[PDB]
Ligand binder design. Sequence first.
Ligand SMILES: [Zn+2]
Lengths: 50, 148, 144, 148, 49, 146, 74, 48, 48
Amino acid sequence: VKAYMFGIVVQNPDTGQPMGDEFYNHILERAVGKAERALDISILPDTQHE
Amino acid sequence: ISLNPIQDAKPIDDIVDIMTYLKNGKVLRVKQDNQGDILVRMSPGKHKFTEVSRDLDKESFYYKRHWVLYNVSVNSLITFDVYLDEEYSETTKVKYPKDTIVEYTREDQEKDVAMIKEILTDNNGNYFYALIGETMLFDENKLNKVKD
Amino acid sequence: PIQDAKPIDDIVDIMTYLKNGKVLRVKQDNQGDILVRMSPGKHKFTEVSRDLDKESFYYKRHWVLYNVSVNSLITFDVYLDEEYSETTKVKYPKDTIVEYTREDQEKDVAMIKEILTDNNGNYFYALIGETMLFDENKLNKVKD
Amino acid sequence: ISLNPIQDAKPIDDIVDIMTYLKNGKVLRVKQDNQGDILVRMSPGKHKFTEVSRDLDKESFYYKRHWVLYNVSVNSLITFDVYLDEEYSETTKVKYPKDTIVEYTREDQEKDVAMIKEILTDNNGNYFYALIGETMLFDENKLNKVKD
Amino acid sequence: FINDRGIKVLWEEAYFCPCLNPDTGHPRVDCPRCHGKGIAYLPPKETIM
Amino acid sequence: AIQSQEKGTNQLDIGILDTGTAIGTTQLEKRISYRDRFTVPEVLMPQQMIYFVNKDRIKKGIPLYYDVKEITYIATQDGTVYEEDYEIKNNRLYLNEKYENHTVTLKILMTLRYVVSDILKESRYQYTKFNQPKSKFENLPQKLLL
Amino acid sequence: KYENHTVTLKILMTLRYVVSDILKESRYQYTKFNQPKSKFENLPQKLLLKREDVIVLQDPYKVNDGIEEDLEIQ
Amino acid sequence: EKPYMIGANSNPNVINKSTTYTTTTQADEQDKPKYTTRLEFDTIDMIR
Amino acid sequence: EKPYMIGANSNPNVINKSTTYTTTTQADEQDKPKYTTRLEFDTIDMIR
Ligand SMILES: [Zn+2]
């Protein structure tokens, strides 16, 4: 994510804090989830009892 | 049917214990008069130096504090009250802290001043106040503060 | 050995001595030496002096307020003012870049680890990584 | 399981060899303090004159350097370090170049200063450092530099 | 804004030296605090202006 | 409201002197007069001064040229001075016997003050009639040169 | 060698100033928005500065810090 | 478990609030920052 | 052959960066150019 934002730093304006990696993981998990519906797929490997 | 007493954040007066805690690396919180409340820390590792952060909350998995190098002054520590960040918290911003002299109305319609020796809380989050010389615990509305 | 230096290690001891009110001497880099002091009376705050010589009928120290930084204290060397020695008459100071030759006739650089002398005034020097002593001539002062 | 040692770009101090190389036509690279890094060249053919280019990369089939006439000064050469453009390169911008005195922690917990005599690299592109008096090659993180 | 457009500068406050002659009201030619000028100075304070 | 505040210093044979122009604007219905006086407790002004002590001034108390709100810094030939050695009462200063023939200097903060040295664009007027039972006369703000 | 010779120098010196007057000296704001209570803030002064030529004093003796500039951290 | 409801107000009434004056002190402080865009001249273009 | 992946960051942390001061020197230099449009008066039209 940072690489595609090369040259941009996401930082609070009133304090020097940058947003942590955990937020990115949380977003990424929702990004892969949204994709898994948007094309009707199962993308990560998982075992199914059907 | 209540919650046990809650300790107040003891201010630290002696500079020696402040420096000892800092050398141990325990975080300190400094109430600057002019520009608000800040955290103070000693850098880990060999390159020792003091650091400051205004990420003014308890550290959390989702909220990691960022530390900037700063040349903290001795006089700043001495003149400004300092607290251990493990204690100072939003949990209880009691209107009448411990050891504060407050004015309370007695049953004989005679106002008396007593020093709060113990404070606790209950299910509703109320602030029960204990006053020296009396056993019954007063409430927030009954009491009053006298300043200067 | 020589009794010309007794540096303080812990900042806690420094603060303890400051509470006792004893004066301190704080070195600088390419800059004048400093004396530091805690003000007396009701209000406690640090004070500094650019003067160094002992107080006397003909010489009095001048003190003013300053927001001394703990970084200076922890980093720079500190001594008790009363017990400080002005100079040890040796060619090379302690913690100075020097060059020498190893036992196998191999040249190597190092810093001075200890400064020593005999009873006759002959000065011996010990380098880092070298347990043996070195003559003043055998050493070489490396240029910055 | 490594790559052989990499030579550092030797600065040229003697003006005589600089002028001889220039007369031979070999390219020179001048590190100007104020306005960056430039190339210097002698014009081919009979009309001899010095030329400058800021096309600051190795010549390539897809990237041909453009040369402008300039009155290069002797003092500029003397006061500014100059390198052969065949050597000076991005390949290895090592933090601790050869002949540099660096501070390294020994196994006895005693910090010593030694001069880097040899430097090499491995598959990962790491910078293995050789220090006089020791055979084991140190790593980038372990070492430290002392300036002034 | 000020920190942006300013330049780093050392601010040292001014105060009359004690060395002033009590009778003439004019200063000593040379003393450590003030070099002939009748006004001494405090330690500097780093500032952007 | 106050504008253009100036601490104009003139250095002369009699000494230094502080004098400057400050332009003020009042509310409505207020009719200021020549040499009226204003004081702004909020705003403090730094001044510096020096006095010479003798065996007589030590007991009477030093009469200060300025007023006092609080003292920033005191000094003498022997160095600084602490709160244990000096006191101020009724805008005059007392010292202990240690400084019988010493000099003393002070950096001092005092309240900002002004006097009306002229009244300028003195009256502005409006017959306000809209949304009134009858015509009414209102005096608009004066401008003061303080 | 230069006992009775003349000597001349082209020299670089630090810029210096003194406050010869304070101008538009105080500007004020009762800042109240997004505050628990009304607060008074002093806005910037304007200074009329004067150069130091007739009398020159050396640069002030600032207390140095032992923090190395441009220090690597890891 | 229980539904989350607004409930009643808790702020008490305050009368005659006085202004805050910044206290003078010789002690050091730290200047609270704002991190944002910076404006600069194109000095290269100035040379041009 | 292998897929090209971003991998990890390599930039180390730096603290207390000091400003760069242009060094005074009597030696010659070369003024780094910018090639771009030039503005000029229409002197012929000025004559007119
Ligand atoms: Zn003087």
